[PDB]
């Protein structure tokens, strides 16, 4: 809150929001209060609201928060997950499968979501580009089961062309971070929103269909894929 008052945009990382809920359950039991549904504290929604309502964009600065979430017994209807999800604007899912492929960021483009993915907020251009990438990535996941069960020859010309764009899209979702130079052996990159939208828009339209997919791996902006290709 102090830095926000200074005139800054701040990041607040909470190691685990489920442990904040459990600490409230433990304190409520120690004070002798009557327990609620599934054994949680009667103050569950108020204790979450008191914390989450301070994290907002004011007229001086803005505190943005990244919170790790744990789901009890894999149940999304349990009071703790239910209450927390009511205050979340975006959901980032990290995938063990994607990591094996070699994409280190490891964010799942199909399971991850945001409430800001609306044309009335980000404009028609950003929205169509993002939904285009998700559409292509969905079709490729279905086609991969076909290629596996029946074979690659069973696909149409349009489907094989889509698979080639989907693979290029999937690798262009990778990026070298300044803190990962020790692992990647390459310098870090900070891509802008403008460069991000322009890069994916071209690959969906087919402007880069002649380039090899590897040229679209760990490069940053789209001009760097074109240069990694000439070589």
């Amino acid at each position: 809150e102090k830095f926000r008052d200074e005139g800054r945009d701040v990041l607040l990382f909470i190691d685990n929001i489920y442990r904040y809920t459990l600490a409230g359950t433990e304190v409520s039991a120690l004070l002798g209060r009557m327990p609620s549904a599934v054994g949680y504290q009667p103050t569950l929604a108020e204790e979450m609201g008191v914390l989450q309502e301070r994290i907002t964009s004011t007229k001086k600065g803005s505190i943005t928060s990244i919170q790790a979430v744990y789901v009890p017994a894999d149940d999304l209807t349990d009071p703790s997950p239910a209450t927390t999800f009511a205050h979340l604007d975006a959901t980032v899912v990290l995938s063990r499968d994607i990591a094996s492929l070699g994409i280190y960021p490891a964010v799942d483009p199909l399971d991850s979501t945001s409430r800001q993915l609306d044309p009335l907020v980000i404009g028609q251009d950003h929205y169509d580009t993002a939904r285009g990438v998700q559409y292509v990535l969905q079709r490729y996941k279905e086609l991969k089961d076909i290629i596996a069960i029946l074979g690659m020859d069973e696909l149409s010309e349009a489907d094989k062309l889509l698979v080639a764009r989907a693979r290029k899209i999937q690798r262009f979702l990778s990026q070298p971070f300044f803190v990962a130079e020790v692992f990647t052996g390459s310098p870090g990159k900070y891509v802008s929103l403008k460069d991000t939208i322009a890069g994916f828009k071209g690959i969906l339209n087919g402007d880069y269909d002649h380039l090899p997919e590897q040229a679209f791996y760990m490069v940053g902006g789209i001009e760097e894929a074109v240069e990694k290709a000439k070589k």
């Binding site: 433990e26 304190v27 039991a29 120690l30 209060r33 017994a73």
Partner: protein, 365 residues
Amino acid sequence: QTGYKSVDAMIPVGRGQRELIIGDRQIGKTALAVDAIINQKDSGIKCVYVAIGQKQSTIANVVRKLEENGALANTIVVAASASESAALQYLAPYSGCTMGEYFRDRGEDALIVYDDLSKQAVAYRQISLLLRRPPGREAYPGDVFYLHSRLLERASRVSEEYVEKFTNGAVTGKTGSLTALPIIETQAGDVSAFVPTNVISITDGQIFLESAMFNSGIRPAVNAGISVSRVGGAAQTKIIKKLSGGIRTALAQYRELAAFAQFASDLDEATRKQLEHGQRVTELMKQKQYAPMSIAEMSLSLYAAERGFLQDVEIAKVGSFEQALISYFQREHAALLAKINEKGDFNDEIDAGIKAGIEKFKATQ
């Protein structure tokens, strides 16, 4: 090292780590922890076994087994049997931890086993409800998480500066540690119960034992698909870290393609090759009680499977093949096993040396 190929290769435990042994009743939880203590008789790690709420004749069979295997002289046994006061059962893990902390604070290494943290929680619940403290979920008091967390955060690795500060300079250059192997019993595989949920969240990793695997002849019963060590490869010697990578891929492939076993003929050749490899690596993980294996002896078995030396061995003869191969190397390659056992090191000369011995074994034995 615990002496088990399934644990030491896929769920490695490091000095100062806290690894939970979790599963239902009567599936080898006690056997896995006692064998982990037996394997320390030559390692340098002092061991502590804490018995909470057990019957007195059961504790005596473990001590008789520690004495028969030569591990008792390196172990402290702390007992709080089922007829003893709930206060003594509640305090026993802290008493055993205090005895283990002596070696850690003075620059040495120790291992502690809490045979039933779930029985310590039950004893603490009795005292609390009798003092009339406000109850929560499953009638446990509001500080049952703090009970196990205060105990388990003492198991740690301390720096050289802490040991030089505590010893007042006497011990220098040495880092001390206390490794913990807490045990918890689940009811009908329900890991979502209150006490199991707390301890799963406190520990660095979990070894899950399963009743279905134990009844299917998979004696160590370790479900490698859900068991995990957050420390991972940092807790492994160079040789086992290199040969465990493919073992992981082969078991993962076996979990995916195991229904096709009855339709293996109709399988595609590549897949049929993967399926038999998965079934031979799965049969390799089976081991016997009170038979801990050394870094060199585990390396022979893992090397033989990972480098393809089992493709001509019937899945039913993989075990006699392993037992005979180790006995051959113990007689004709004693110097190479002694070399690997120094630090678990690996290089082009050890790789070629093991290969030559396995090829010679197949040619005459």
